[PDB]
Design a protein around this ligand. Structure first.
Ligand SMILES: CCCCCCCC/C=C\CCCCCCCC(=O)OC[C@H](COP(=O)(O)OCC[N+](C)(C)C)OC(=O)CCCCCCC/C=C\CCCCCCCC
Ligand SMILES: CCCCCCCC/C=C\CCCCCCCC(=O)OC[C@H](COP(=O)(O)OCC[N+](C)(C)C)OC(=O)CCCCCCC/C=C\CCCCCCCC
Ligand SMILES: CCCCCCCC/C=C\CCCCCCCC(=O)OC[C@H](COP(=O)(O)OCC[N+](C)(C)C)OC(=O)CCCCCCC/C=C\CCCCCCCC
Ligand SMILES: CCCCCCCCCCCCCCCCCC(=O)OC[C@H](COP(=O)(O)OC[C@H](N)C(=O)O)OC(=O)CCCCCCCCCCCCCCCCC
Ligand SMILES: CCCCCCCCCCCCCCCCCC(=O)OC[C@H](COP(=O)(O)OC[C@H](N)C(=O)O)OC(=O)CCCCCCCCCCCCCCCCC
Ligand SMILES: *[C@@H]1O[C@H](CO)[C@@H](O[C@@H]2O[C@H](CO)[C@@H](O[C@@H]3O[C@H](CO)[C@@H](O)[C@H](O)[C@@H]3O)[C@H](O)[C@H]2NC(C)=O)[C@H](O)[C@H]1NC(C)=O
Ligand SMILES: *[C@@H]1O[C@H](CO)[C@@H](O[C@@H]2O[C@H](CO)[C@@H](O[C@@H]3O[C@H](CO)[C@@H](O)[C@H](O)[C@@H]3O)[C@H](O)[C@H]2NC(C)=O)[C@H](O)[C@H]1NC(C)=O
Ligand SMILES: *[C@@H]1O[C@H](CO)[C@@H](O[C@@H]2O[C@H](CO)[C@@H](O[C@@H]3O[C@H](CO)[C@@H](O)[C@H](O)[C@@H]3O)[C@H](O)[C@H]2NC(C)=O)[C@H](O)[C@H]1NC(C)=O
Ligand SMILES: CCCCCCCCCCCCCCCCCCOC[C@@H](O)COP(=O)(O)OCC[N+](C)(C)C
Ligand SMILES: CCCCCCCCCCCCCCCCCCOC[C@@H](O)COP(=O)(O)OCC[N+](C)(C)C
Ligand SMILES: CCCCCCCCCCCCCCCCCCOC[C@@H](O)COP(=O)(O)OCC[N+](C)(C)C
Ligand SMILES: CCCCCCCCCCCCCCCCCCOC[C@@H](O)COP(=O)(O)OCC[N+](C)(C)C
Ligand SMILES: CC(C)CCC[C@@H](C)[C@H]1CC[C@H]2[C@@H]3CC=C4C[C@@H](O)CC[C@]4(C)[C@H]3CC[C@]12C
Ligand SMILES: CC(C)CCC[C@@H](C)[C@H]1CC[C@H]2[C@@H]3CC=C4C[C@@H](O)CC[C@]4(C)[C@H]3CC[C@]12C
Ligand SMILES: CC(C)CCC[C@@H](C)[C@H]1CC[C@H]2[C@@H]3CC=C4C[C@@H](O)CC[C@]4(C)[C@H]3CC[C@]12C
Ligand SMILES: CC(C)CCC[C@@H](C)[C@H]1CC[C@H]2[C@@H]3CC=C4C[C@@H](O)CC[C@]4(C)[C@H]3CC[C@]12C
Lengths: 1012, 35
């Protein structure tokens, strides 16, 4: 047992420092959340008796809680009194209720609730829900807490966990018969021989990609005769190569035995099976794309990735499946009866069952798969509601902890075992000196940064701000004119060839062009035509000039462009591996998504099976003008819609809405029935395993080895860093390399004599550390519904601890003579004991009622005690080292973060204009919309982690009633309140991909700065 | 008539169990259950 004990201690030791840092940072941010947010989740829009009553209207007051549910959901609308909070509708007041959202489980009102909320924010599990609730109640300007806890903790700590796993493996690797005439007549090998087969596969897959829901019978006949012709072609090729080759030699090879299986399936289904959910076998012909792997090195790499998963690393891919199945077994046996009995509590209002249960063994496997995909909070809420809370808590976290690590561990293992093995000339010189001057660079950067910021103010409310419109209109005109003149100056100074062979001055040639055609169209006629509107929407990419005029921006873009061929190759291989699933899903679910609903109050009710079964039933039961035959917005109805559905399934956003429609689908024109095709969940589990794990592993590996190649080619850290930033990096390394220290001259004089010794004592420092520990637990035990007796005690203890800290700081200032100020961490202690003093004094002054004293300002000021626990970084050497690595990465992190902020700004200015009038449906709220720049930035920060992009795109996908309203009296601009489908698709897909790229850039930067 | 997993049919009759004839080309297949 000593061997397994050593294995366990090593396994924890590799993750010991990162785990301690995770728990410490999570506890600190839990304290921050508790202190700033507490009770604001109990802020429901409780109604008042607005109309007067002759007699008392509070006779009972037992059930006066007239809540108002949020439009499109069965959840009460949250609110806040702050100016930046969410405001109640007319006739309602915001009140402190006694219930938190999400079955009274999502709250910041206590230590444990805050810890769970911060853990969920770390794991990113529907964090945009906690984020939208908190910004609904506390206020928009509190988005800063979420940015801090997303960029740090979540992003950085996932980086640290991933790098710890990678370091542990790499360590592990370091430790490591007249017919013979007809037979030879064959001669299959020929010019264009295998390339006539490759072309046939390409054309056949292109045929299959043209199947859709609304296809003419002639089109379907033409698409079936083509499939018949290609079956004939493949059968021909097979028999003609059987006769040409020897009876054993042909079937000796797996690449010919693969075609044998494919063609025998194509024969034994196209005539021995119907398409009664068996169109998947009709889609077995798509599997012939494996042939192109010989001419496609990246496709061969992906095939080798899958094989290594099933081959040498089968030892770890059999562990994944077996732990999933064991979790499923235990979960079903423990909670299926509770799920069945109490399904009434966790079901939708119109369903007898919840969508996600653990009743069967299939559904328990499915919830375990969802957990490993990274969605556990909602199912944990339902599972805690129905079954025992302690048993539910243990299972869901254990599956999330063990299940996610082994997926990452096998991801890393697969990432190394499959990837590492005259007057004119006078004027020309004048222009040269003018444009090369030091007052022509800082001026242009300032102007670029004032053309950026000027775009943020052109919002929906710009109509309500009349003078701001003219101000912005003439700050844009003058800026574009000055940019045009600056470009003309550069043209006069340098050569046209020197201009046109640069990778940046072209970018700004294009921005100048779009701005100059926009203004020219505005001056001239046709300014109100759709092409000119399209040209004027492109003004959001003007901030790309700061991408050229800043050296860090130049460096980061050049670094990412150095990997453009690898990126494009992986894009091509991923795209076509996803084409197989797109066509397969289209064949499975093409046209089977539509359904009838009841449109009552912006709340859609699925008509029950008894009254409606058909597109024709739903219409013969259209007594009230509220029965609507509508399609699910993300459908497998075309190849394009199929791929937007595949992207949503891979990104795990919009995932459930597709998994439900596909599974419930019975047939075409026939009403969906609950779990009629319950085994389409297996289909989705197979496109997520393959088009998720394996394509992502291929992309990672390819990007890593491109960046490693560039790093070893340059032999320098300046992949993303600058020259001055490299010097600053050297300065920071020197700070870290400062191992020797000068011993302090002990004060010989009696004053400070024994004081210095008692201060520099190990007993003294351990006492201060444990005192910090008690103080941490003291501010940790602080609940919302607390007695005034409890608040007084907490304030008294806070004052005592502040006094003790001030005494220690003054004692060190006295005994240690300016060598206290010599040390940086001692300086941090001094500043965090002068901030605690200032916060206490300010709280006392405000409590004297000098003016209005909002409790939120008291909470903000009370955050100043965060230093008293941030002082504990010294006590943990591992935490100190990881924080030092973070500080080391801050140059490159700042560069790539500024690139990400620039892309956020560009997409924000895009959204502010393309989508202000879209109706609030699922993720768009009065707050989280694209009518003002702050709201746009809230949405874009949210979807930079790809969270809620389905919710923010579904209102865009609306094209008519009952979901939206063409011809709405107000908001006449965007055809009422219906979104542009193609524009929204391009926006959200390109944004999530482009930021997936830039986040991978930050991830690899942090990891390679941790290696050094 | 009643051709099990042969892809026959092509006539005015159907096939017995889990078997129905098809559209376009006339073949009766194991549509009801597995072949
Ligand atoms: C979709 C997933 C498809 C499977 C990947 C197969 C990769 C192998 C390539 C097939 C061509 C072939 O055979 O040639 C390559 C070698 C044998 O050829 P060689 O001896 O010349 O070398 O392939 C081999 O055997 C190497 C081993 C390949 C095994 C990897 C796949 C494991 C099983 C996956 C099941 C997925 C089920 C999907 C359900 C959808 C509905
Ligand atoms: C490899 C896996 C690829 C699976 C193919 C992907 C398509 C969806 C799943 C599937 O396979 O097809 C779904 C059809 C549904 O049609 P049905 O209602 O007639 O179901 C058969 C009769 N019923 C309901 C009593 C089971 O058939 C089924 O449900 C089959 C359900 C069971 C399939 C088990 C696949 C296990 C593979 C494990 C590899 C790891
Ligand atoms: C980004 C922001 C922070 C990056 C994470 C923190 C890691 C870097 C902080 C350490 C640092 O600055 O160098 C060491 C300082 C030096 O102190 P000194 O400057 O007086 O030099 C005089 C002393 N001599 C002569 C030794 C240089 O010793 C100290 O640690 C004193 C305190 C330094 C700053 C706070 C310590 C970090 C505490 C919490 C994490 C920071 C919150 C922000 C988290 C990331 C935000 C994105
Ligand atoms: C990985 C280790 C995991 C260990 C899991 C097992 C832990 C021990 C057993 C389970 C916990 C302790 C036993 C009791 C648990 C159930 C107690 C219970 O009944 O309430 C559980 C609470 C919910 O309370 P409520 O809804 O506000 O009150 C009812 C409401 N007023 C009503 O009637 O309408 O629900 C809450 O308290 C919400 C906050 C839970 C905090 C959990 C934090 C875990 C963070 C992540 C840890 C790993 C990292
Ligand atoms: C890795 C990347 C994976 C993600 C790829 C995303 C692909 C998005 C494809 C676009 C969605 C396709 C789609 O919605 O169908 C096409 C749509 C809608 O036309 P329709 O109403 O069905 O036509 C009815 C017909 N006239 C009839 O009545 O019979 O026509 C439209 O109006 C909108 C869709 C087409 C334009 C948008 C194309 C997508 C570009 C963005 C790709 C993102 C890549 C990253
Ligand atoms: C799942 O849902 C059922 C039904 O919605 C819940 O049953 C309800 O449980 C509560 C709490 O025990 C009952 O209230 C109490 O009931 C009795 C009097 O009937 C008494 O102990 C108390 O005065 C109190 O009113 C409630 O009556 C009961 N409702 C029904 C319709 O049975 C159940 O608690 C939920 N359980 C889970 C595990 O989700
Ligand atoms: C969905 O499918 C079709 C429309 O696509 C609906 O067809 C209707 O089916 C009902 C019930 O089978 C037929 O009623 C019939 O009436 C008499 C006496 O009851 C008798 O012939 C049958 O026993 C049957 O009950 C009705 O005529 C038929 N309508 C047509 C053919 O136009 C069907 O109801 C829809 N829903 C379901 C649940 O099948
Ligand atoms: C049951 O009857 C109601 C009441 O007429 C039907 O609602 C109507 O649905 C159609 C098709 O969705 C709507 O037409 C479309 O509306 C807009 C312009 O309003 C535009 O997208 C299209 O050009 C088209 O005209 C119609 O406006 C809508 N009317 C109302 C009052 O809601 C409903 O479709 C019927 N249910 C079924 C299952 O047929
Ligand atoms: C990339 C993969 C190759 C194929 C890439 C091209 O495939 C596009 C098709 O899905 C477009 O379908 P349709 O243009 O027929 O749209 C018809 C719309 N209804 C009739 C279905 C509504
Ligand atoms: C290189 C980077 C170029 C982009 C540089 C863009 O600069 C403008 C942004 O900072 C946004 O402007 P504001 O400071 O007005 O922030 C909005 C705050 N409220 C008022 C909406 C809350
Ligand atoms: C944040 C994601 C988007 C970032 C990029 C957006 C802006 C694109 C421009 C970025 C600047 C860097 C791109 C290129 C870096 C690679 C290095 C610079 O690229 C040089 C190419 O422009 C020309 O390539 P050649 O030198 O092979 O051919 C010269 C042919 N002429 C021009 C002499 C006739
Ligand atoms: C082995 C079984 C466990 C599988 C992993 C279980 C967890 O699944 C995570 C994957 O689905 C992630 O999918 P991606 O977002 O990487 O999809 C990438 C697609 N594009 C963006 C590259 C096109
Ligand atoms: C439930 C049904 C649909 C699943 C049946 C499997 C079908 C879908 C396909 C998917 C990928 C295929 C595999 C792909 C490649 C190889 C390697 C080859 O050397 C032997 C056949 C083998 C191992 C194939 C067997 C059949 C296979 C597993
Ligand atoms: C519907 C689909 C399958 C048919 C059209 C896809 C075509 C364009 C795909 C299929 C295979 C692909 C090729 C496979 C391999 C290579 C080798 C690489 O070094 C250059 C690109 C090249 C030559 C690819 C170009 C694009 C390609 C030809
Ligand atoms: C130093 C010891 C106490 C551990 C430090 C963690 C402390 C702060 C944790 C551990 C258990 C937690 C308590 C467990 C249960 C409850 C009941 C809840 O309705 C109010 C908060 C309260 C009382 C929690 C407050 C925070 C708490 C006391
Ligand atoms: C030269 C080879 C052996 C080095 C391999 C070890 C390092 C570089 C590898 C192993 C695992 C890799 C990480 C795997 C997962 C991710 C998350 C992904 O979204 C971006 C890339 C990123 C962040 C990779 C960065 C580089 C990485 C840490």
């Amino acid at each position: 047992l000593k061997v397994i004990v050593g294995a366990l201690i090593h396994s924890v030791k590799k993750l010991a420092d990162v785990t301690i840092l995770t728990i410490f940072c999570l506890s600190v941010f839990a304290l921050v959340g508790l202190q700033l947010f507490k009770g604001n989740l109990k802020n429901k829009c409780v109604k008042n008796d607005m109309a007067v009553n002759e007699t008392t209207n509070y006779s009972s007051h037992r059930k006066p809680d007239i809540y108002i549910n949020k439009r499109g959901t069965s959840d009460p609308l949250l609110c806040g009194n702050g100016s930046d909070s969410g405001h109640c509708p007319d006739g309602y007041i915001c009140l402190k209720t006694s219930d938190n959202p999400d079955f009274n489980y999502t709250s910041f009102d206590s230590f444990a609730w805050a810890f769970l909320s911060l853990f969920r924010l770390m794991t990113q599990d529907s964090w945009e829900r906690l984020y939208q609730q908190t910004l609904r109640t506390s206020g928009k300007i509190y988005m800063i807490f979420f940015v801090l806890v997303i960029f740090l903790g979540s992003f950085y700590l996932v980086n640290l966990i991933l790098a710890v796993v990678t370091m542990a493996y790499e360590e592990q690797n370091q430790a490591t018969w007249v017919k013979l005439k007809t037979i030879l007549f064959g001669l299959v090998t020929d010019p264009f021989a295998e390339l006539t087969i490759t072309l046939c596969i390409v054309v056949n897959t292109i045929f299959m990609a043209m199947e859709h829901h609304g296809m003419s019978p002639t089109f379907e006949a033409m698409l079936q005769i083509g499939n018949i012709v290609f079956t004939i072609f493949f059968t021909a090729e097979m028999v003609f190569k059987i006769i040409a080759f020897d009876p054993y030699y042909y079937f000796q090879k797996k690449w010919n035995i693969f075609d044998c299986i494919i063609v025998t399936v194509s024969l034994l289904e196209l005539g021995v099976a119907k398409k009664g959910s068996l169109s998947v076998l009709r889609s077995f012909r798509l599997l012939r794309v494996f042939k192109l792997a010989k001419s496609w090195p990246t496709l061969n790499t992906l095939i080798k990735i899958i094989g290594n998963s099933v081959g040498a690393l089968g030892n770890l891919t059999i562990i994944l499946a077996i732990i999933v199945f064991v979790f499923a077994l235990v979960g079903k046996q423990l909670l299926g009866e509770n799920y069945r009995n109490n399904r009434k509590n966790i079901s939708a209002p119109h369903e007898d069952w919840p969508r996600w249960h653990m009743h069967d063994f299939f559904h328990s496997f499915l919830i375990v798969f969802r957990i490993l995909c990274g969605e556990w909070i909602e199912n944990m809420w339902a599972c805690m509601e129905v079954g025992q809370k302690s048993i539910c808590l243990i299972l869901f976290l254990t599956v999330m902890v063990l299940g996610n690590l082994v997926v990452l561990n096998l991801f890393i293992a697969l990432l190394l075992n499959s990837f590492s093995a005259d007057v004119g000339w006078q004027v020309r010189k004048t222009c040269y000196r003018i444009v090369e001057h030091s007052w022509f660079e800082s001026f242009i950067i300032f102007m670029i940064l004032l053309s950026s910021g000027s775009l943020a103010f052109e919002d929906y409310y710009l109509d309500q701000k009349p003078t701001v419109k003219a101000l912005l209109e003439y700050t844009d005109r003058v800026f574009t004119f000055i940019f045009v003149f600056e470009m003309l100056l550069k043209w006069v100074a340098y050569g046209f060839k020197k201009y046109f062979t640069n990778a940046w001055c072209w970018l700004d040639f294009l921005i100048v062009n779009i701005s100059l055609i926009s203004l020219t169209a505005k001056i001239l006629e046709y300014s109100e035509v759709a092409p000119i509107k399209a040209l004027r929407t492109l003004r959001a990419l003007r901030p790309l000039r700061a991408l050229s005029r800043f050296e860090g921006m130049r460096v980061v873009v050049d670094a990412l462009v150095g990997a453009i061929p690898s990126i494009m190759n992986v894009l091509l291989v991923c795209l076509i591996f996803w084409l197989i699933f797109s066509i397969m899903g289209v064949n499975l679910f093409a046209g089977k998504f539509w359904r009838c609903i009841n449109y009552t109050d912006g709340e859609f009710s699925l008509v029950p099976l008894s009254i409606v079964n058909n597109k024709s039933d739903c219409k013969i039961q259209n007594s009230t003008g509220s029965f609507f035959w509508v399609n699910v917005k993300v459908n497998f109805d075309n190849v394009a819609m199929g791929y937007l559905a595949l992207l949503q399934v891979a990104t795990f956003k919009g995932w459930m809405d597709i998994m439900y429609a596909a599974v419930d689908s019975r047939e075409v024109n026939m009403q969906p029935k609950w779990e009629d095709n319950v085994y389409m969940y297996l289909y989705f589990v197979i496109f997520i395993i393959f088009g998720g794990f394996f394509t992502l592993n291929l992309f990672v590996g390819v990007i890593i080895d491109n960046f490693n190649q560039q790093k070893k080619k340059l032999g320098g850290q300046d992949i993303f860093m600058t020259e001055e930033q490299k010097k600053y990096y050297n300065a920071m390394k020197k700070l870290g390399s400062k191992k020797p220290q000068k011993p302090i001259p002990r004060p010989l004089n009696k004053f400070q004599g024994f004081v210095f010794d008692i201060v520099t004592r190990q007993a003294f420092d351990i006492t201060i550390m444990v005192l910090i520990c008690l103080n941490m637990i003291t501010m940790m035990v602080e609940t919302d519904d607390q007695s005034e007796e409890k608040t007084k005690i907490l304030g008294k203890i806070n004052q005592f601890f502040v006094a003790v800290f001030t005494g220690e700081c003054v004692m060190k200032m006295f005994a240690l003579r300016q060598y206290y100020f010599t040390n940086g961490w001692n300086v941090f202690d001094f500043i965090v004991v002068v901030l605690s003093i200032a916060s206490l004094i300010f709280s006392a002054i405000l409590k004297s009622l000098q003016s209005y004293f909002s409790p939120t300002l008291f909470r903000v000021i009370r955050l100043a005690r965060i230093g008293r626990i941030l002082r504990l970084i010294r006590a943990a050497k591992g935490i100190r080292t990881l924080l030092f690595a973070l500080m080391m990465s801050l140059p490159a992190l700042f560069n790539i973060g500024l690139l990400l902020f620039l892309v956020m700004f560009i997409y924000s200015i895009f959204g502010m204009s393309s989508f202000p009038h879209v109706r609030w449906e699922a993720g768009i709220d009065d707050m989280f919309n694209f009518q003002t720049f702050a709201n746009s930035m809230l949405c874009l920060f949210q979807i930079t982690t790809s969270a809620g992009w389905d919710g923010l795109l579904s209102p865009i996908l609306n094209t008519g009633p009952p979901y939206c309203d063409p011809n709405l009296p107000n908001s006449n601009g965007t055809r009422g309140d219906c979104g542009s489908p193609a524009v929204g698709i391009i926006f959200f897909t390109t944004y999530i991909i482009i930021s997936f790229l830039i986040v991978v850039n930050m991830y690899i930067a942090v990891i390679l700065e941790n290696f050094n | 008539e009643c051709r099990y997993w042969l892809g026959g049919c092509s006539a005015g009759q159907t096939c017995c169990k889990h078997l129905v004839c098809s559209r376009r080309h006339g073949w009766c297949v194991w549509d009801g259950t597995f072949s």
